[PDB]
């Protein structure tokens, strides 16, 4: 029965607190988060499968993300990826 809509709204209220979002637009955002989800994850799975490991680690998601996001988006994506894994390792 679920969606990501809640989260997209949290993040929205970080980058533009005074700003809101149409419904049809939130819909656009949701099938987006799922498209990217699916893309990264699939690529991770191929990487597991090619390099014969039955476990997907943050490392796969990383290589996947450098494969799929173009230019500087991959750079920053990889950044906040590893930053969240490090600040997670701590607690």
């Amino acid at each position: 029965k679920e969606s990501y809509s809640i989260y997209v709204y949290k993040v929205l209220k970080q980058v533009h607190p005074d700003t809101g979002i149409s419904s049809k637009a939130m819909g656009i955002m949701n099938s987006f988060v799922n498209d990217i989800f699916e893309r990264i994850a699939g690529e991770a799975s191929r990487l597991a499968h090619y390099n014969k490991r039955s476990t997907i680690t943050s490392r796969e998601i990383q290589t996947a993300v450098r494969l799929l996001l173009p230019g500087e988006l991959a750079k920053h994506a990889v950044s906040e990826g590893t930053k969240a894994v490090t600040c997670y390792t701590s607690a």
Binding site: S31, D35, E38
Partner: protein, 78 residues
């Protein structure tokens, strides 16, 4: 019913498409072409449908077919 697609609505399309001057024979080409496009989406959709044993073709079915044709579409599902 394909002729339900009017010449002013085609020319509205092409106008959004940034066209300034449009031949006459464009219209029956565009009709041919649109017919083909639909035929392929729909065929795939309806296939997704009667795989689910349904007699109602859902939006999400149309979404999936569109993703297979590589014409991915946001705002109905994925």
């Amino acid at each position: 019913n394909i002729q339900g697609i009017t010449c002013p609505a085609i020319r509205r399309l092409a106008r959004r498409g940034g066209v300034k001057r449009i031949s006459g024979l464009i219209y029956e080409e565009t009709r041919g072409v649109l017919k083909v496009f639909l035929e392929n989406v729909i065929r795939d959709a309806v296939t997704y449908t009667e795989h689910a044993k349904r007699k109602t073709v859902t939006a999400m079915d149309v979404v999936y077919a569109l993703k297979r044709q590589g014409r991915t579409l946001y705002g109905f599902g994925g």
